[PDB]
């Protein structure tokens, strides 16, 4: 029944957003809740944020 087919290939680039599942190798799952500005990140005395 099919005369012709057109397959289009899209490359979607997704970055990261609240709701994604993330986990370490230790069985600690987690789902990113908020995406924080660099300003509110806890930083050490040297000033390098976490």
């Amino acid at each position: 029944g099919v005369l012709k087919i057109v397959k289009v290939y899209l490359a979607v680039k997704r970055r990261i957003q609240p709701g994604d599942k993330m986990a370490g190798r230790h069985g600690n799952k987690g789902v990113i809740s908020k995406i924080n500005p660099i300003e509110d990140m806890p930083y050490d005395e040297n000033g390098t944020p976490v």
């Binding site: 660099i38 300003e39 930083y43 005395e45 040297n46 000033g47 390098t48």
Partner: protein, 309 residues
């Protein structure tokens, strides 16, 4: 009753970072400022990051250029980190050309009056074959904050240059800002403190400029702080004339005749049009057909075009 502070020796250490200091600091104000400045320092500052890059034979960022070992995506990624600085221009397009086997650094671009390459050794990509050549249009603009390529397309409006690969905006001089208030004993005062703000940078901004504009915005925000249903005509009439999808010839005549919106067009008359330059019977025939197709015609009089805001 209070003491105002001011700067003192600003000690550059490397081309990247430096340590500025602020003496005249009263009791506890070292914190009141130091964090508030870090806040405005890390975020909102002026910066110039590469944005749109159109290259030679490359259709999209996912392809591979024959003769170069960097995937296009990777070359785009390298550019986001090219630090540059301009002076009197808010966007400039730099032309990079090079060929032959070897590293293509960031100094190989073509210099402009405002072009300052702060990292001439910065690697754009390698080149793997004797005759293999890469030409590229690199569009750098200046701005504030983080504008990812995603939000970049809303406006659109003929971004058709399929060859133009957008990249994400890195705009920011500041890398890392840290402040420490050590007690500064000025020869006479009870106890006053100092401020050692050690910052870190991509080399496109000087310490005094930053720390000045930082406090600039700060008080500028305190400014405010310190004190305390009837559409008439058819909406289609305010759509631009470009929405008619006329012939190249026909479209240019209307812009040339001061006819920019559909509302302007429906007023003009058949008689007038053959008298306007370049339009004959052939051109006019096209126009009458497209208008009937959207329920319009020529020469309708509106006693109130347009209203009223």
């Amino acid at each position: 009753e209070f003491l105002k502070p001011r700067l003192v020796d600003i000690e550059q250490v490397s081309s990247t970072h430096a340590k500025v200091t602020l003496e005249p600091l009263e009791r506890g104000f070292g914190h009141t400022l130091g964090n508030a400045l870090r806040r405005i320092l890390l975020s909102s500052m002026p910066g110039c990051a590469v944005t749109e890059v159109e290259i030679d034979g490359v259709l999209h960022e996912y392809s591979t250029k024959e003769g170069v070992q960097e995937d296009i995506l990777e070359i785009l990624l390298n550019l986001k980190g090219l630090a540059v600085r301009v002076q009197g221009k808010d966007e400039v397009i730099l032309t990079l050309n090079k060929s032959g086997i070897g590293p293509v650094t960031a100094a190989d671009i073509t210099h402009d009056g405002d072009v300052e390459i702060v990292k001439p050794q910065h690697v754009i990509c390698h080149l793997t074959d004797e005759n293999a050549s890469i030409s590229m249009r690199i569009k750098v603009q200046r701005g504030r904050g983080y504008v990812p390529a995603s939000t970049r397309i809303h406006s659109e409006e003929d971004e058709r240059p399929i060859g133009r690969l957008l990249v994400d905006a890195c705009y920011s001089p500041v890398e890392r800002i840290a402040y420490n208030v050590e007690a500064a004993r000025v020869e006479q005062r009870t106890d006053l403190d100092k401020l050692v703000i050690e910052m870190e940078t991509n080399g496109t901004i000087d310490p005094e400029e930053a720390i000045r504009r930082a406090a600039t915005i700060l008080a500028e925000q305190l400014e405010a702080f310190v004190d305390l249903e009837k559409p008439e005509f058819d909406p289609i009439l305010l759509r631009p004339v470009d929405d008619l999808e006329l012939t190249v010839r026909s479209a240019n005549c209307l812009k040339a005749e001061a006819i920019h919106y559909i509302g302007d067009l429906v007023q003009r008359t058949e008689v007038e049009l053959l008298k306007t330059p370049n339009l004959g019977k052939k051109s006019l025939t096209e126009i009458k057909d497209v208008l009937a197709s959207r329920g319009l015609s020529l020469g309708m009089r509106l006693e109130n075009w347009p209203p009223a805001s």
